Amino acid sequence: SHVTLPFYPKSPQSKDLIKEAILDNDFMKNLELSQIQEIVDCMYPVEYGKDSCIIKEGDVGSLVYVMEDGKVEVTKEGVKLCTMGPGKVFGELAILYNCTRTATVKTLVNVKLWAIDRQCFQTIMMR
Amino acid sequence: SHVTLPFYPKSPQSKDLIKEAILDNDFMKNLELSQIQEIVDCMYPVEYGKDSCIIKEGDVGSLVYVMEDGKVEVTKEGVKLCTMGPGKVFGELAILYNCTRTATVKTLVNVKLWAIDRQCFQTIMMRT
Ligand SMILES: Nc1ncnc2c1ncn2[C@@H]1O[C@@H]2COP(=O)(O)O[C@H]2[C@H]1O
Ligand SMILES: Nc1ncnc2c1ncn2[C@@H]1O[C@@H]2COP(=O)(O)O[C@H]2[C@H]1O
């Protein structure tokens, strides 16, 4: 008996965008392509209106995100670090390294995201 | 044709302690019992004194460790990330994410560890 990872059907554009977002991320870019494929398939969609706090610094984290549409701002202790648009990963640090969120992430406009949780991610790492 | 993995004889007591540390690990929980047993068999003992740097961030990582005794401190560019005590695994990230060491690991007291090299660990993961 092995657990079946949930599959979320996606458009090819979406799959390409997720794959390129991972390959753009310094910390995830070296994962096997086969693992990236499984991450792509397991990611599920989530949506936020503007001025939404997706991630609060210091919280425990469960999800890594890929941005499909929109723009976020990353701040730490009130200080703007950057902004991110489509094709970018965020919220990966807590999941990769098992720490609390290292920064806060808010939406500047509406956003569409893809998300995958640690548990699913770690299973994929072990295959 | 097929690599024979090293076997390191160990007391039953040590096998148990290593098995527990592995079963306590997020990633390692995913493995089959038999793979976990094979990891236990491939591990070999290594010790470090107080104030040793076992793992330096940015290096190539070819070893995964279980800590039997002792306490260790994890840093990144000088900044304390956390500490880890007995029964914990460390050094698995470089292997699992296929990258250089993501943090620096220094001993806070004398430690006693078990180590498995990357070849064995990956071989065992492949052999489901
Ligand atoms: N200095 C930075 N520059 C760009 N993004 C950052 C920076 N610091 C933190 N982040 C992002 O903000 C996220 C907050 O949650 P995480 O710590 O899980 O992962 C973090 C990164 O994705
Ligand atoms: N918060 C952390 N960030 C990065 N590595 C950590 C952290 N906490 C513990 N570690 C361990 O530090 C190890 C350093 O080598 P690795 O990157 O191979 O594997 C890493 C983890 O096992």
Author numbering:
A (entry chain A): 92 to 218
B (entry chain B): 92 to 219
Tell me, in the authors' exact words, what the paper reports.
The cGMP-dependent protein kinases (PKG) belong to the family of serine/threonine kinases and are one of the major intracellular receptors for cGMP. Next, two cyclic-nucleotide binding domains (CNBD-A and CNBD-B) are followed by the catalytic domain. Binding of cGMP to the CNBDs is thought to induce a conformational change that activates the kinase by removing the autoinhibitory domain from the catalytic cleft, leaving the catalytic domain free to phosphorylate downstream substrates. To understand the overall architecture of the cGMP-binding domain and the molecular features required for cGMP binding, we determined crystal structures of the CNBD-A of human PKG I bound to cGMP, cAMP or in the absence of bound nucleotide.
Despite its unique crystallization buffer conditions, the PKG Iβ:cAMP complex showed similar crystal parameters and contacts as the PKG Iβ:cGMP complex containing two molecules in the unit cell. cAMP:A is similarly located at the interface between the two molecules, but makes no hydrogen bonds with molecule B. A surprising feature of the PKG Iβ (92–227):cAMP complex is that cAMP binds in two different conformations, anti in one molecule and syn in the other. While the sugar phosphates share the same set of contacts with the protein as the PKG Iβ:cGMP complex at site 1, each purine ring of cAMP shows different contacts with the protein at sites 2 and 3, depending on its orientation. For example, the hydroxyl group of Thr193 at site 2 interacts with the unprotonated nitrogen at the 2-position through a weak hydrogen bond for the syn-configured cAMP whereas no such contact exists in the anti-configured cAMP. Cys173, makes a hydrogen bond with the unprotonated N7 of the syn-configured cAMP, whose distance is 3.6 Å, but no such contact exists for cAMP in the anti conformation. In contrast, the structure with anti-configured cAMP shows the highest B-factors at this region, indicating that site 3 residues do not interact as strongly with the adenine ring. While the PKG Iβ:cAMP complex was crystallized in the same P6222 space group, with similar crystal parameters and contacts, cAMP:A does not form hydrogen bonds with molecule B and PBC:B shows no apparent contact induced structural changes. Since a hydrogen atom replaces the 2-NH2 group in cAMP, no such interaction is possible, and cAMP binds the PKG CNBD-A in both syn- or anti-configurations.
